[PDB]
Amino acid sequence: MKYIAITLGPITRTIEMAESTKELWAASYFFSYLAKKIVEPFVKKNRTFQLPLINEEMQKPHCGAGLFPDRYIFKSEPGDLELLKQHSDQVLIEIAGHIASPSLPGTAKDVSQIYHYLKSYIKIYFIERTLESDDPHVVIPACEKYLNIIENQETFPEQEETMISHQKSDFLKFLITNVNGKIYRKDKNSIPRFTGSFLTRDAFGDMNGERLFESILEISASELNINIQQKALEVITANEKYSDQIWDAEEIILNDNKAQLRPYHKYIAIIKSDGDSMGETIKSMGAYNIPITQLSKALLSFNIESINEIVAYGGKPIFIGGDDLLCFAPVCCNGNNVFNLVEKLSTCFDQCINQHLQQYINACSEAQRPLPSLSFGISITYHKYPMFEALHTTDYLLEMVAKDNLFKYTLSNKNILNENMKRFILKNKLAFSLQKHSGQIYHTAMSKKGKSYVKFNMLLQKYILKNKDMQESEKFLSSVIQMIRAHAEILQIILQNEDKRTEMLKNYFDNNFNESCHLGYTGLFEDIQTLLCLRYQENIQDYQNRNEIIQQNTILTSDEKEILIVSPAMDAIHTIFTALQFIHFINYNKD
Amino acid sequence: MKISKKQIEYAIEALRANNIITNDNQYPKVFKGYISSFGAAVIQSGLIPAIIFFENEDNDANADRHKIIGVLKDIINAMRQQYTVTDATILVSSQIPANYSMAQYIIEHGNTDQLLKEITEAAVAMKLALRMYKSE
Amino acid sequence: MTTRMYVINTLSNMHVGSGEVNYGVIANLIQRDSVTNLPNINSSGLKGAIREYFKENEDLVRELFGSAPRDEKTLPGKVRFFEANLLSMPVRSDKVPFLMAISDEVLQELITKMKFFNCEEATQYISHLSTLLDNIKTQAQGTDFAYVFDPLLQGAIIEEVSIRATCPSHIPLQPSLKKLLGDRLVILSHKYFSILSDDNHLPVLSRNNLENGQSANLWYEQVLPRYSRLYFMLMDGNAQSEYLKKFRDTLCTPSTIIQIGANASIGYGYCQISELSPF
Amino acid sequence: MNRHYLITLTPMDWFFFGGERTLDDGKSADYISHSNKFPQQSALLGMIRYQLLKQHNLLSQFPYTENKPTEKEIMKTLIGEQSFRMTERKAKSLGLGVIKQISPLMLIECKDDTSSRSIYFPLPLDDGYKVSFNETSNEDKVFYNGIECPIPNVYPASRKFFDHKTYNNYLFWCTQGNNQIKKLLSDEIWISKMQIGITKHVEEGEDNDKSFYKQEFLQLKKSFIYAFYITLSGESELSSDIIQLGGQRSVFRMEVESIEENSDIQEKYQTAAQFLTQSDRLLILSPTYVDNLKELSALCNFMWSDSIVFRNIQTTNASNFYGKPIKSSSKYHFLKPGSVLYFKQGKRKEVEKLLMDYTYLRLSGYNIYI
């Protein structure tokens, strides 16, 4: 029977048009809101939905984040194609009217050119297919493969009428750059409040704690418990456009709290996540008779709890829906670091998969099958850093490294991707990078399918100073960081030794740190040794065969082979080194 | 300077071969002082007297101090192996015979600081490699 | 009135900044060519240093280099500065304090660039450099080499690479070639030169900031050894002849010292610019 | 009569073809500027005009100046009264001086041989796959923003279906082999470096506007050059010289070669591109500017197309040549090279008519297809 599938619009271009996090969140919520408005008439008509599970929970504003994906598959009864057609421009007139409103800054408007620009730019495609199946399990891949090729049709505005004072045509830029409103003095004596727009009104309302969003430093420092936003808004409102001054005021007020300021309060973490190989999870939920609606339920529950947990840590969700996640979090917040948030989100994923997909795990993964997984990409940068390049770094970490799409892409560009080489693709990874104010990068990749991730989290939690308390934490030796870097070759020799590496590592650390001052750091040395051994074992088990097949694959040149060949022991040393540097960076203040 | 991994590997092999490290990865605890003192003595008194002192077998020493000279010899032989052979190379690459003692070898072939440099690097490699084992 | 080749003799250490995201122990790293990975000076740095030296000559600056930033009327510059490429480098020896190291690949690249740019006084230099390179390859026979051109310098040891230098008695170095390349010259294989010019063999200096006896900061800095020679190309867009003559006369006078680098107050990067002399 | 030249450009240094959100644009001036791989054809026109005035010693020097009538008329007869303008997109004449037509800029590889030069083109988006377009009554159908079109069944011509993860045709450029299309990765043609630049003096300034700018400079691999064909009115002459094409004073070398007369350069370019022809699609070899994309999508069903931004510097013979140039008030979106227009049965003629109705853009090597 009839099925209708919809792809939403040019999300990547609109995201690239943004410049800061407000514009990014506005751009993401624009597409979330567009999908919401498009699908609401069909949801209220109670159509049979296949790709998402649009229950009552998604429609409720959940901390101002976009849960509605860009793909939907209908079960069509004759008479909905044309009403979808009419609603497609009904939404366009509605958005044109919403933008053409004095609630937003600017100087007059015109709905007609806004509508024409939106229709030229926003690409609403819907496919109609009459296939013989009442089973969603073959329905969704069949519609998805056609949607993927349908996506590659370019509709754009030909003339873009710019400058000339105001004959604006870059209306999406207009919306995203002015999405919070105006300061709106309210009287002679007020606390300033932003006006708001359709996006931030469809988002969080007026139930307290709704002081919208502005700049980045209140995200990066949402623990100091003194009011960044109002303390900086008074400064700008005490004088005579939107973000740069209040951002400028915000760094001034934060700098004025020098007594408790810690270096990480100026560093911001961008967290991107994606579901690890959910198409093959669908296929395996295939051959084994299990409905896909369970996967939809699990992803829904994970999305809701992910928004809750991110806002609990002190982070601002940008888009959590389907299998995809993007968030803006502080480096530290109330004794929890970013890696604690990553671990909590991972555990939320496993918990939801357990709760809803219990049949699949109980029937398949025990025999032999990889469970569904989540890959994480984290980037920590100064607040005065290009947002576009930070998001590029996060995308690189997530795709090229965390998903090992560098391996796949280098192999496929030269057409080497045999099935045996596809067996060596790796998932379930944490890609983490940190750029200082200088340019020194600390980057590392770890596998979350093992005890190395657990021990890494425990080491971080153990040796990070907790200022919120003031009883004590196990002390840290900063000379171990330089020892790991300088003695890396000897450590590699120890790691490559078989069935004596544990005793050798213990002996090396004892014999290098042989002074009376090192009697207090035996716990740290032991934890480092355990983590290093675990990471070396994981790395050999993940990479030895992959490297020995890459080495004698006489289709790749030496440069790409070297960029593809990973040394297990050296990677373990680098991971431990980067973790120790992160601990030191969080701990060290410059009083 | 950095730590040469290959020289550390030669040190491991030579320490095992010359019977300083036992089968349960242990040494008699006087040898670390032996190596450190060898480096200091080479700096302070000269190569030949230090080699003669540590190579002497009629000593009232706690353990077999002359084994460190055997380890030195093995490391130097190993590094002289895999020396590149180009007509612009200052290195000899000739292997020290097992018949020869180190002191006579430096006496009859000792006109260049190549032996001094190699001995300094070998002593450093011994010092850093011995830290991977335990002292009885 | 055309393309000209200029030579930079460095009188102290040079640190021309990279700003690149360092991964290792050295915080400030010097500029290297993106392809050859040999040390280089950017066109922007050369232009800035030469403009700073000539800052008091307003008319010359306006005519030759252009308008100032933040200025109005924004006139363009007539002269175009090119990348400064490392020609010769000082390496340590035992008979002499240092030898000045030139590679065969850097020599061939110089010949190729002089052909491509068509330097004014280049036809003679190309012929003699090509003959020297061909003689060197005939004597080398494909083996790694280190050739001195002073009979007193035979038997010299390049300590970092541990290489003995030989004197080919039938490979003549002409006096202008010495005046260009350097005084105590070794022509060696580019592998040896790249080893001698990499990050592990460049002079690294430790620095710190002290507050009443307690050190506040610490970092490591990479520099380029003094007496190193760098060559760059200059094209004048048919500029005013008198201003150009003043420029050439000032640059080619012995008493002119130019500052290119990232530490002016501690003497980093004071250079002397030489123009290609007739052969 | 008319005189036809082939003009080869060789990069002397790292070049910068930039523009869109470039530096000094204001509104978060975005110090980080990335270089476009090719210059706009307007840059080619302007370079030709600048060199034409250089040969005849008719340039503007010194602060704001004047012009006597007779040199004004000779500039009229040599270059024209007005630069390449988008408003004259449907003018049947180029509106310039001796310049009549230029081919789109072409990437040329120069092997160390008397052997001819290999012409490299962007890889067609449909290369490697077949689009079947099964249309016999309603069996499947898609609406592109409210227009009826057939369904694009795409299979790898090697069944399976189009996996967008495998899709990497946008990273490749192609040239002619014996009977195999030679695929070259874009990185193997253009190498990029990021430059950090500052102003040393330090005065009162604000971010994106005081110092600390980053620019992407492109270098073209060893044996590759840029080229195009030009037709001149025959009363002028073009001489080999050293040129400035692009931003930050990117310097090139002109080699001007005279090709044999009575040679339509459009036919030459299309002969070069002949090896990429497919009977069921129109291959866009250079940016196109259909005035209604909905109109084009009416007659084309699957437009495997991309978009590039075009913005032009607008000057006349009497303009402040030392000052912020007047930019085109409108941003014009153009069809990327390598784009594929899949037409209905027949109907190729009037879509071709729509494409060729911009004769001014056709003459400035823009709406070229095969």
Ligand SMILES: Nc1ncnc2c1ncn2[C@@H]1O[C@H](COP(=O)(O)OP(=O)(O)OP(=O)(O)O)[C@@H](O)[C@H]1O
């Ligand atoms: N709500 C949902 N319910 C069921 N399946 C979903 C849902 N959202 C997304 N999916 C599935 O996730 C996939 C979306 O594409 P995506 O690139 O994220 O897949 P993937 O296999 O996880 O990718 P990767 O190769 O990066 O691991 C599709 O296979 C789609 O069926």
Ligand SMILES: C[S@@+](CC[C@H](N)C(=O)[O-])C[C@H]1O[C@@H](n2cnc3c(N)ncnc32)[C@H](O)[C@@H]1O
């Ligand atoms: C990975 S790229 C490829 C998809 C393609 N560009 C598109 O949008 O159809 C875009 C991805 O961004 C994610 N995304 C979807 N809707 C989003 C939104 N409203 N805001 C942010 N990201 C979104 C989805 O995972 C989608 O696949």
Ligand SMILES: [Mn+2]
């Ligand atoms: Mn995804």
